Amino acid sequence: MLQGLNHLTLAVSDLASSLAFYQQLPGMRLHASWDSGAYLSCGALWLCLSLDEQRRKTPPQESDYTHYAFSVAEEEFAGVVALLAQAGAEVWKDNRSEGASYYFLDPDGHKLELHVGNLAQRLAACRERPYKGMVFFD
C-alpha cells in the first residue's frame, strides 16, 4: 500500500522570496524552479513551492495549529536556533517540555517547526508520563 510522504507542496505568494528562505537558511538542495513553482529537496523529503496567487501571508493568530516539522541533529540545534533568531524568523510558540523543539513560520505564514527526536523516542517518553487519556496500540 502506501509507502510514505511522496512530496509536500506549499502555496506561496512571492516565489523568489519564499524559495530564497528555504534555499538559504534551512539550506534545502534547490533542484529546479520555474515561473510558477520550485522543487527543493531535503534527503528523504521532497518539497514543492507552488506559486498560488490566493495565498495571503496569514498571521499565526489567524491560522490553525497545522504545521510542518523538520528533523535536525541534536548537536546542530543551537546553531540553527540562532540561525533563525538572528535572521529574525518569527516565532509562534515556545515549545514547553515535550522535548527540544523550536517553532517558527515562513514568509507566507506557514507554521514550521524544528524538532529533535523520532516517533519512537516520543512514544517511549509518553510511556513514562502520558497525556490526558492516552492509549497505546503498537
Ligand X SMILES: O=c1[nH]n2cc(-c3n[nH]c(-c4cnc5c(Br)c(=O)[nH]n5c4)c3[N+](=O)[O-])cnc2c1Br
Known binding residues for Zn(2+) are 7, 67, 113
> Nearest distance from residue 88's CB to its own copies, in Å?
19
Pull the grid cell for residue 101: 523543539
| 78, 98, 100, 130: which one binds its own copies (CB under 8 A) | 130
**Interface with ligand X includes 137 (CB under 6 A)?**
no
Q: Say how many C-beta atoms besides its own lie within 10 A of residue 47's C-beta.
A: 22
Pull the grid cell for residue 12: 506561496
Query: Identity (one letter) of the amino acid at 110?
Result: H
Instruction: Give the span between the Cα atoms of 111 and 88, in whole angstroms.
Output: 15
Q: Among residues 54 and 86, whose Cβ is nearest to ligand X?
A: 54
84 DSSP assignment: H
| 14, 42, 81, 93: which one binds its own copies (CB under 8 A) | 42
| 20, 55, 95, 100: which one binds its own copies (CB under 8 A) | 55
